[PDB]
Design an enzyme around this catalytic site. Structure first.
Site, PDB file in Angstrom:
ATOM      1  N   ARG A 132       0.087   6.246  18.095  1.00 34.97           N
ATOM      2  CA  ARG A 132       0.354   6.945  16.832  1.00 34.97           C
ATOM      3  C   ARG A 132      -0.402   8.261  16.713  1.00 34.97           C
ATOM      4  NH1 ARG A 132       4.653   3.836  15.825  1.00 34.97           N
ATOM      5  NH2 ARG A 132       3.974   1.652  15.928  1.00 34.97           N
ATOM      6  N   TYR A 133       0.356   9.277  16.362  1.00 33.53           N
ATOM      7  CA  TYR A 133      -0.107  10.612  16.408  1.00 33.53           C
ATOM      8  C   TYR A 133       0.318  11.214  15.117  1.00 33.53           C
ATOM      9  CZ  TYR A 133       0.454   9.714  21.506  1.00 33.53           C
ATOM     10  OH  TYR A 133       0.396   9.195  22.763  1.00 33.53           O
ATOM     11  N   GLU A 165       7.857   5.289   1.135  1.00 33.66           N
ATOM     12  CA  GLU A 165       7.671   6.632   1.639  1.00 33.66           C
ATOM     13  C   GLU A 165       8.721   7.046   2.667  1.00 33.66           C
ATOM     14  OE1 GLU A 165       3.526   7.713   2.611  1.00 33.66           O
ATOM     15  OE2 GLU A 165       2.884   5.901   1.539  1.00 33.66           O
ATOM     16  N   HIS A 207      -1.705  -3.360  11.845  1.00 34.61           N
ATOM     17  CA  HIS A 207      -1.421  -2.662  13.112  1.00 34.61           C
ATOM     18  C   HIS A 207      -1.130  -3.587  14.294  1.00 34.61           C
ATOM     19  CE1 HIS A 207      -1.646   1.272  11.468  1.00 34.61           C
ATOM     20  NE2 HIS A 207      -2.950   1.286  11.277  1.00 34.61           N
ATOM     21  N   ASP A 221       4.615  12.028   6.919  1.00 32.75           N
ATOM     22  CA  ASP A 221       3.210  11.698   6.951  1.00 32.75           C
ATOM     23  C   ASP A 221       2.581  11.974   5.555  1.00 32.75           C
ATOM     24  OD1 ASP A 221       0.553  11.291   8.520  1.00 32.75           O
ATOM     25  OD2 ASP A 221       0.358  13.261   7.510  1.00 32.75           O
ATOM     26  N   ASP A 265      -4.224   8.035  -2.624  1.00 31.49           N
ATOM     27  CA  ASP A 265      -4.986   7.516  -1.494  1.00 31.49           C
ATOM     28  C   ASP A 265      -6.177   8.448  -1.235  1.00 31.49           C
ATOM     29  OD1 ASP A 265      -2.839   5.449  -0.804  1.00 31.49           O
ATOM     30  OD2 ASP A 265      -1.742   7.221  -0.105  1.00 31.49           O
ATOM     31  N   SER A 325       3.854   2.725   2.223  1.00 36.00           N
ATOM     32  CA  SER A 325       4.829   2.889   3.272  1.00 36.00           C
ATOM     33  C   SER A 325       5.463   1.594   3.781  1.00 36.00           C
ATOM     34  CB  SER A 325       4.132   3.510   4.457  1.00 36.00           C
ATOM     35  OG  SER A 325       3.216   2.584   5.015  1.00 36.00           O
ATOM     36  N   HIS A 380      -7.174   3.629  -2.121  1.00 33.82           N
ATOM     37  CA  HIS A 380      -7.071   2.977  -0.819  1.00 33.82           C
ATOM     38  C   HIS A 380      -7.958   3.658   0.209  1.00 33.82           C
ATOM     39  CE1 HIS A 380      -5.503   1.089   2.702  1.00 33.82           C
ATOM     40  NE2 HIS A 380      -4.995   2.210   3.180  1.00 33.82           N
ATOM     41  N   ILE A 419       0.793  -1.216   0.000  1.00 35.19           N
ATOM     42  CA  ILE A 419       0.000   0.000   0.000  1.00 35.19           C
ATOM     43  C   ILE A 419       0.832   1.275   0.000  1.00 35.19           C
ATOM     44  CG2 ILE A 419      -2.006   1.070   1.056  1.00 35.19           C
ATOM     45  CD1 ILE A 419      -2.299  -1.919   0.019  1.00 35.19           C
TER      46      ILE A 419
HETATM   47  N1  LIG Z   1      -2.505  11.491   9.003  1.00 38.31           N
HETATM   48  C1  LIG Z   1      -2.733  10.152   8.851  1.00 38.31           C
HETATM   49  N2  LIG Z   1      -3.954   9.662   9.186  1.00 38.31           N
HETATM   50  C2  LIG Z   1      -4.212   8.368   9.046  1.00 38.31           C
HETATM   51  C3  LIG Z   1      -3.188   7.468   8.547  1.00 38.31           C
HETATM   52  C4  LIG Z   1      -1.872   8.065   8.201  1.00 38.31           C
HETATM   53  O1  LIG Z   1      -0.904   7.392   7.735  1.00 38.31           O
HETATM   54  N3  LIG Z   1      -1.735   9.380   8.374  1.00 38.31           N
HETATM   55  N4  LIG Z   1      -3.493   6.109   8.396  1.00 38.31           N
HETATM   56  C5  LIG Z   1      -4.485   5.614   9.364  1.00 38.31           C
HETATM   57  C6  LIG Z   1      -3.995   5.471  10.807  1.00 38.31           C
HETATM   58  N5  LIG Z   1      -3.324   6.659  11.355  1.00 38.31           N
HETATM   59  C7  LIG Z   1      -1.980   6.801  11.579  1.00 38.31           C
HETATM   60  C8  LIG Z   1      -1.514   7.887  12.283  1.00 38.31           C
HETATM   61  C9  LIG Z   1      -0.167   8.056  12.544  1.00 38.31           C
HETATM   62  C10 LIG Z   1       0.762   7.129  12.118  1.00 38.31           C
HETATM   63  C11 LIG Z   1       2.241   7.237  12.378  1.00 38.31           C
HETATM   64  O2  LIG Z   1       2.969   6.346  11.926  1.00 38.31           O
HETATM   65  N6  LIG Z   1       2.752   8.209  13.133  1.00 38.31           N
HETATM   66  C12 LIG Z   1       4.117   8.104  13.614  1.00 38.31           C
HETATM   67  C13 LIG Z   1       5.082   9.186  13.135  1.00 38.31           C
HETATM   68  C14 LIG Z   1       4.555  10.026  11.977  1.00 38.31           C
HETATM   69  C15 LIG Z   1       5.432  11.245  11.758  1.00 38.31           C
HETATM   70  O3  LIG Z   1       4.865  12.328  11.667  1.00 38.31           O
HETATM   71  N7  LIG Z   1       6.768  11.026  11.713  1.00 38.31           N
HETATM   72  C16 LIG Z   1       7.817  12.051  11.742  1.00 38.31           C
HETATM   73  C17 LIG Z   1       8.245  12.164  13.227  1.00 38.31           C
HETATM   74  C18 LIG Z   1       9.744  11.982  13.507  1.00 38.31           C
HETATM   75  C19 LIG Z   1      10.140  12.159  14.960  1.00 38.31           C
HETATM   76  O4  LIG Z   1       9.439  11.770  15.854  1.00 38.31           O
HETATM   77  N8  LIG Z   1      11.281  12.791  15.193  1.00 38.31           N
HETATM   78  C20 LIG Z   1      11.740  13.174  16.522  1.00 38.31           C
HETATM   79  C21 LIG Z   1      13.200  13.627  16.436  1.00 38.31           C
HETATM   80  C22 LIG Z   1      14.093  12.529  15.875  1.00 38.31           C
HETATM   81  C23 LIG Z   1      13.945  11.314  16.742  1.00 38.31           C
HETATM   82  O5  LIG Z   1      14.331  11.374  17.907  1.00 38.31           O
HETATM   83  O6  LIG Z   1      13.379  10.207  16.227  1.00 38.31           O
HETATM   84  C24 LIG Z   1      10.939  14.287  17.170  1.00 38.31           C
HETATM   85  O7  LIG Z   1      10.188  15.116  16.438  1.00 38.31           O
HETATM   86  O8  LIG Z   1      10.970  14.450  18.389  1.00 38.31           O
HETATM   87  C25 LIG Z   1       8.994  11.809  10.784  1.00 38.31           C
HETATM   88  O9  LIG Z   1       9.185  10.626  10.206  1.00 38.31           O
HETATM   89  O10 LIG Z   1       9.842  12.655  10.492  1.00 38.31           O
HETATM   90  C26 LIG Z   1       4.046   8.087  15.106  1.00 38.31           C
HETATM   91  O11 LIG Z   1       3.652   9.186  15.785  1.00 38.31           O
HETATM   92  O12 LIG Z   1       4.353   7.053  15.680  1.00 38.31           O
HETATM   93  C27 LIG Z   1       0.296   6.030  11.442  1.00 38.31           C
HETATM   94  C28 LIG Z   1      -1.045   5.877  11.167  1.00 38.31           C
HETATM   95  C29 LIG Z   1      -5.721   6.472   9.245  1.00 38.31           C
HETATM   96  N9  LIG Z   1      -5.404   7.878   9.370  1.00 38.31           N
HETATM   97  N1  LIG Z   2      -0.149   4.982   1.688  1.00 39.35           N
HETATM   98  C1  LIG Z   2      -0.382   5.073   3.132  1.00 39.35           C
HETATM   99  C2  LIG Z   2      -1.805   4.628   3.453  1.00 39.35           C
HETATM  100  C3  LIG Z   2      -2.148   4.815   4.924  1.00 39.35           C
HETATM  101  S1  LIG Z   2      -3.952   4.808   5.074  1.00 39.35           S
HETATM  102  C4  LIG Z   2       0.641   4.203   3.791  1.00 39.35           C
HETATM  103  O1  LIG Z   2       1.005   3.124   3.099  1.00 39.35           O
HETATM  104  O2  LIG Z   2       1.135   4.495   4.892  1.00 39.35           O
HETATM  105 ZN   LIG Z   3      -4.921   3.132   5.188  1.00 36.49          ZN
END
Ligand SMILES: Nc1nc2c(c(=O)[nH]1)N[C@@H](CNc1ccc(C(=O)N[C@@H](CCC(=O)N[C@@H](CCC(=O)N[C@@H](CCC(=O)O)C(=O)O)C(=O)O)C(=O)O)cc1)CN2
Ligand SMILES: N[C@@H](CCS)C(=O)O
Ligand SMILES: [Zn+2]
Length: 766
Positions: free
Chosen positions: A529-530, A498, A706, A503, A613, A447, A656, A445
């Site tokens: 997850r945020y 990705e 998940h 995000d 998506d 990521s 998706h 999908i």
């Molecule tokens: N917006 C959104 N909604 C969605 C989805 C989605 O993918 N996105 N899919 C479904 C489920 N929702 C989801 C929501 C969040 C995450 C997710 O993976 N979030 C991650 C991180 C996402 C992110 O913004 N990552 C940044 C944050 C990096 C980071 O934390 N860096 C540190 C510094 C470096 C370190 O120490 O790692 C910091 O800022 O403090 C990046 O890669 O750059 C998390 O908080 O666990 C997944 C699914 C439905 N809705």
């Molecule tokens: N293309 C996104 C879908 C999340 S709903 C991913 O693979 O993370």
């Molecule tokens: Zn999804």
């Protein structure tokens, strides 16, 4: 002296303290004592924070380690039997429902069990764990895990903080839940009699502890509710109300409750609460219903968006209320829990001060309600009104906001701009012929695991500790790794992981004119997850290419077909904080036209298989049948279609959708060639029937992405066999429920290897 109220506060922490401890506990790096210790610490902080802010009515039980709904599913003991036969402790049973669990026999005793369904909390990108009920379910009030809302009231009280527990009410609780597959003949709301005596018990436990007033959420009232549901509210609240319980403040939000007034116009409760941000106009009618005693909480500070409040306009509403029901029976309140907002704006140091002055996150919103309340109380807060009034004027008048070149371009939108050059059956023949794809084709999908190495390097880049040249090198290594693997494993249509994308929406807000975006602006989406959704502040355009440089390199190292990946226009809207001035219709469209230019750029750059998506398409649906919904249906698809209808037939547009009560008929309007539908984690019994008639190609999701659970090659086969009984093979694709960011590599490898291994069997049987 008019009082202030808050409906809920974000539990994640100013530094995502909560995430960090939860994930530690899950990975065996923190004790159960240490998790609970930090919970307490945060709970303490936020109460104190609000207390200092001047808030009078302060929530308790808004805290949660995962989800406040599940928290109740625990307390009331709606715990599917399969989760019980492993001697897990209350906290872990809680988490297992959440994300499944799987460990081989260690001392430690061997478990393997899936996770329950997760779905959109109304029209929000917060997801709850859906109650799951069964004929066997014995509703008792669990005390093994402690009794959470009691214990947290007591905590607060031991710091001299009087709080208002928050509990989802029986009717919402049930109506939102579901029957488990061992009990398909079960309307959840029929258990109302079994469950009340529990809610009753809880309530007395709370009264004894010191609970004056309890907020009891019954937000289902903003929805279309059949007649036989409406009549159950009296039954319910008649049961619960008494001298042995606290007063109850029946709480609604996110929309309009007028159609349901009859439902609630003769209930015993102590007062109500309503959202006069989203539906101010309902005030006269609802205020009508209030028989003496009762108080009106006037929801007027947006718990769902971050625009700074207009103190003039907000106070005018509270005064309209005060006119109808008396100053002494009115309360200034958030429209909803601030769960859906970030913690503190002051944590943001890289936003234009002009733009920043337009916003308010949770911390600020506390001042907001404090001040409005003060205003209507006759107290002098002159200096804050003017400053506020300045902030508004400024927003009102800005060169930033408008972009004529966009507004015009809108009038190029018509049926032709949103129809493809030929119908799907005709494009399939062209696609089959280009791609040579095999039966039961496999893909994922988008990521792939967001490894701390990726997080750290995105960050070192952001903060100038490495050059762009160094970051490109790093991303290429990781796309190479992600491809090389996909090839190894046998996957048919590839993605690129990705790695370069924080995000799927934020990556885009950082690239489109019209946006703003945060550094520490995080909101919870589910569990640990945020996201920090971006914010739309003006007219939207795409000045450069966003994703080409990466996908072209991706395509360049594999002979395999490779997907591009965007985010459709409705999802970018829905998972951003939307504009104050304008409708979402106007915003989607802008996005559609804007996203066209990327889609086109991709096709042109070599990338002839493309995924856009649109997972929020159901989320974004209005909460009530009528004019507004049927419009939504039409423009929502149109905008998607806008970003995808310029492509050649030989190009393969994918979509998706996930974690929602999906409406196939609307999904079909997108006339996409191929889609991915979350199916495994959600244990939906009907999805198969309800998608019986879907005309284009489709992959119902084969495993729950998940959970760290690795499904047997066998569990794949079963599902497939099951689907094939209603669907022909000449349509079916094979894929996971959703993406793999949150997943670790070990289980990614083995679980896809199984998926593919399994696909390969059905390949040869046919
Ligand atoms: N917006 C959104 N909604 C969605 C989805 C989605 O993918 N996105 N899919 C479904 C489920 N929702 C989801 C929501 C969040 C995450 C997710 O993976 N979030 C991650 C991180 C996402 C992110 O913004 N990552 C940044 C944050 C990096 C980071 O934390 N860096 C540190 C510094 C470096 C370190 O120490 O790692 C910091 O800022 O403090 C990046 O890669 O750059 C998390 O908080 O666990 C997944 C699914 C439905 N809705
Ligand atoms: N293309 C996104 C879908 C999340 S709903 C991913 O693979 O993370
Ligand atoms: Zn999804």
């Amino acid at each position: 002296m008019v009082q202030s109220s808050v409906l809920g506060f974000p539990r994640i922490g100013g530094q995502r303290e909560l995430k960090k401890i939860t994930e530690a506990y899950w990975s065996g790096k923190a004790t159960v004592e240490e998790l609970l210790a930090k919970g307490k610490e945060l709970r303490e902080h936020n109460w104190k924070l609000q207390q200092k802010a001047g808030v009078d009515i302060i929530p308790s039980n808004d805290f949660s380690y995962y989800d406040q709904v599940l928290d109740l599913s625990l307390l009331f003991n709606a715990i599917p039997e399969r989760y019980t036969k492993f001697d897990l402790a209350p906290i872990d049973v809680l988490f297992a429902m959440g994300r499944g669990l799987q460990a081989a026999a260690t001392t430690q005793a061997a478990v393997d069990v899936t996770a329950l369904e997760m779905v959109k909390w109304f029209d929000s990108n917060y997801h709850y764990v859906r109650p799951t009920f069964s004929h066997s379910t014995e509703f008792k009030l669990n005390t093994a895990a402690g009794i959470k809302p009691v214990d947290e009231f007591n905590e607060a009280k031991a710091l001299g903080v009087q709080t208002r527990p928050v509990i989802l009410g029986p009717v919402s609780y049930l109506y939102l839940g579901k029957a488990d597959k061992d009990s398909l003949d079960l309307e959840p709301i029929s258990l109302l009699p079994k469950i009340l005596p529990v809610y009753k018990e809880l309530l007395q436990k709370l009264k004894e502890a010191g609970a004056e007033q309890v907020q009891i959420d019954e937000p289902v009232l903003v929805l279309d509710l059949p007649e036989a549901v409406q009549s159950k509210f009296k039954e319910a609240y008649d049961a619960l109300v008494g001298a042995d319980v606290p007063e109850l403040i029946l709480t609604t939000y996110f929309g309009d409750v007028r159609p349901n007034l009859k439902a609630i116009e003769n209930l015993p409760v102590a007062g109500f609460h309503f959202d006069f941000v989203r539906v101010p106009e309902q005030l006269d009618e609802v205020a009508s219903i209030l028989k003496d005693g009762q108080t009106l909480s006037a929801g007027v500070v947006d718990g769902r968006n971050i625009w700074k409040t207009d103190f003039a306009k907000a106070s005018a509403v509270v005064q309209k209320a005060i006119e109808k029901v008396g100053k002494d029976k009115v309360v200034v309140a958030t429209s909803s829990s601030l769960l859906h907002t970030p913690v503190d704006l002051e944590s943001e140091t890289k936003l234009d001060a002009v733009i920043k002055d337009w916003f308010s996150f949770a911390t600020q919103k506390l001042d907001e309600v404090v001040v409005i309340a003060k205003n209507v109380s006759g107290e002098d807060v002159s200096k804050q009104l003017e400053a506020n009034a300045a902030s508004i004027k400024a927003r009102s008048e800005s060169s930033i906001t408008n972009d004529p070149k966009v507004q015009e371009r809108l009038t190029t939108i018509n049926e032709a701009l949103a129809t493809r050059k030929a119908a799907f059956p005709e494009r399939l023949t062209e696609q089959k012929a280009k791609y040579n794809l095999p039966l039961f084709p496999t893909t994922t999908i988008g990521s792939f695991p967001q490894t701390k190495d990726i997080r750290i390097n995105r960050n070192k880049f952001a903060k100038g500790q490495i050059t762009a040249e160094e970051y490109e090198a790093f991303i290429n290594k990781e796309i190479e790794t992600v491809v090389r693997f996909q090839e190894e494993i046998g996957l048919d249509v590839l993605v690129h992981g990705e790695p370069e994308r924080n995000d799927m929406v934020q990556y885009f807000g950082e690239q489109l004119n019209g946006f703003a975006f945060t550094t520490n602006g995080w909101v919870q989406s589910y569990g640990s997850r945020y996201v920090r959704p971006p914010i739309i502040v003006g007219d939207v355009s795409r000045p450069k290419a966003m994703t080409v440089k990466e996908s072209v390199y991706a395509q360049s190292i594999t002979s395999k077909p490779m997907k591009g990946m965007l985010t459709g226009p409705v999802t970018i809207l829905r998972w951003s904080f939307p504009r104050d001035d304008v409708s979402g219709k106007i915003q989607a469209l802008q996005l559609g036209l804007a996203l066209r230019d990327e889609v086109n750029d991709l096709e042109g750059a070599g990338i002839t298989v493309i995924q856009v998506d649109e997972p929020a398409i159901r989320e974004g649906l209005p909460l009530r049948a009528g004019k507004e919904r049927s419009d939504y249906l039409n423009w929502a698809a149109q905008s998607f279609r806008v970003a995808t209808s310029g492509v050649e037939n030989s190009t393969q547009i994918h979509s998706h959708f996930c974690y929602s009560d999906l409406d196939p008929n609307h999904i079909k309007a997108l006339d996409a060639d191929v889609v991915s539908i979350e199916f495994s984690k959600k244990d939906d019994p009907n999805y198969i029937q309800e998608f019986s008639e879907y005309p284009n190609h489709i992959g119902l999701g084969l495993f729950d992405i998940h959970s760290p659970r690795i499904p047997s090659k066998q569990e794949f086969v079963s599902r497939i066999e099951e689907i094939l009984k209603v669907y022909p093979a000449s349509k079916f694709w094979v894929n996971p429920d959703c993406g793999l960011k949150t997943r670790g590599w070990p289980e990614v490898k083995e679980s896809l290897t199984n998926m593919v291994e399994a696909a390969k069997e059905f390949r040869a049987k046919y």
